[PDB]
Write a protein that binds this ligand. Structure first.
Ligand code: HEM
Ligand code: QKM
Length: 413
């Protein structure tokens, strides 16, 4: 090894990792001509679709990111937040006087519910959820670690996936054709943002696949990440170790705001919950949901005295580059308040769990707001104690959340 950087050769290709905040500089800051996403992420293509995201050429690609970006902008966010909150308050109402809950599975149910209404609209969410929660998890199920190198191996799962996507397109066929018949009616969701999107040089719009694809992707990104970091934020907090040292800090801020921005719950009020923003952010720092992020190298680049040829595949791990102790004092242990003047730091790419650069996470705030809302509600309506100790990371999966007896128990407030 070096400490900072280390290539392997595995199967065919050779994987050049980076860990340094200096290291990251080439991974997070060169451009689309210099690093490619095409090859490394090509596993997703026939989960999302043809000419969707990584499916499409560079021209049609950069624009779809933009439609997503604008679908998830501060504007559109402010308008989802109402939906996000209500669902949260609606979900946690249903709970008992007192009882156990697998916080992973519960917040997974709850985020997909809200992922439905913001991404696919009222009709999908009100009429068709249980259908579209199957048609998703059938696409999901066609993601095996084989799929990441042969994403078209004729194996039975891939068929079922390809099949389930086709079906989901025809579902939005109906819903979009309905809407294109009454332009009159205004619409608050992503798919509307997409429906109204058009490319440069052409004014026919995106179609009932391309759209559906674009939305599924955001379904994917939601379920594979928010869902877990949601759970981590709380598993860590309500471990007793940390409940003592941090939970007063927390609930004080829950009251301090409560008496200013009311019993009801609005974005203004989330945006300034600066503690819980950190108390979540630290659960990304310690247990990022994506293990690592990849590019094939196009224009080659030296790093120090280490040459990184062409056809390489440069990695960065969140989980690795955020346990560096020359960058995070006390990295082994759960310190929400580290960010209070870490966030004051100048050097780029010290925190990478939401990546950085040209391709940093277009969902960052959506995630936060979804997540903060969940605990924001859960703190006010319950008292939350952990059963067992802090769950172990679960690498036996494509998704990388906490191991599956990862539960709490609630008693009403
Ligand atoms: C805690 C939750 C999440 C985490 C940790 C996370 C993390 C990341 C990271 C690390 C990247 C960079 C990946 C790369 O370099 O290729 C990224 C990109 C992205 N994320 Fe997320 N993400 C989260 C949630 C979401 C959600 C909920 C959405 C959408 C609803 C979303 C949409 C995206 C998109 C569109 C990009 C691509 C930007 C591009 O390729 O130019 N993410 N995310
Ligand atoms: C492109 C998507 C990514 N997949 C990985 C990845 C996952 C598992 C392995 C393995 N083995 C290797 C790489 C890193 S980034 C993703 O980056 C992921 N995402 C972003 N925010 C939330 N999840 C992605 C990007 C999108 F633009 C849309 C959907 C989507 F899942």
């Amino acid at each position: 090894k070096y400490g900072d950087i280390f290539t392997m050769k595995v199967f065919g290709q050779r994987l050049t990792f980076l860990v340094g905040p200096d290291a990251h500089v080439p991974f997070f800051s060169q451009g689309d001509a210099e690093l490619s996403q095409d090859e490394p992420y090509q596993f997703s293509v026939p989960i999302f679709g043809p000419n969707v995201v990584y499916g499409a050429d560079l021209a049609h690609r950069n624009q779809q990111l933009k439609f997503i970006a604008a679908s998830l902008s501060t504007k559109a966010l402010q308008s989802y937040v109402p939906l996000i909150v209500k669902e949260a308050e609606d979900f946690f109402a249903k709970w008992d006087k007192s009882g156990t809950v697998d916080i992973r599975d519960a917040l997974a149910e709850l985020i997909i519910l809200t992922a439905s209404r913001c991404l696919m609209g009222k009709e999908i969410r009100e009429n068709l959820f249980t259908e579209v929660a199957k048609l998703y998890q059938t696409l999901d199920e066609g993601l095996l670690p084989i799929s990441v190198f042969f994403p078209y191996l004729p194996i039975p799962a891939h068929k079922r996936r390809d099949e389930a996507r086709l079906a989901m397109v025809r579902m939005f066929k109906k819903i979009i054709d309905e809407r294109r018949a009454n332009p009159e009616v205004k619409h608050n969701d992503c798919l509307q943002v997409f429906m109204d999107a058009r490319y440069r040089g052409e004014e026919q719009a995106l179609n009932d696949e391309e759209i559906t694809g674009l939305m599924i992707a955001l379904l994917f990104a939601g379920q594979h990440t928010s869902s877990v970091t949601g759970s981590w934020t709380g598993l860590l907090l309500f471990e007793a170790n940390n409940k003592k040292k941090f939970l007063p800090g927390v609930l004080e801020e829950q009251e301090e705001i409560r008496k200013e921005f009311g019993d009801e719950l609005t974005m203004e009020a989330l945006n300034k919950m600066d503690k819980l923003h950190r108390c979540v952010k630290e659960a990304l720092r310690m247990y990022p949901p994506l293990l690592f992020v990849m590019r094939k190298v196009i224009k080659p680049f030296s790093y120090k005295d280490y040459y990184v040829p062409e056809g390489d595949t440069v990695f960065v791990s969140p989980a690795l580059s955020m346990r560096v102790e020359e960058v995070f004092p006390n990295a082994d242990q759960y310190n929400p308040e580290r960010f209070v003047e870490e966030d004051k730091q100048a050097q780029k790419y010290r925190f990478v769990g939401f990546g950085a650069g040209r391709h940093g996470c277009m969902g960052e705030n959506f995630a936060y707001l979804q997540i903060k809302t969940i605990w924001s509600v859960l703190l006010r309506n319950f008292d939350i104690e952990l059963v067992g100790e802090l769950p172990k990371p679960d690498y036996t999966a494509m998704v990388v959340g906490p191991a599956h007896p990862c539960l709490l128990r609630y008693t009403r407030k």
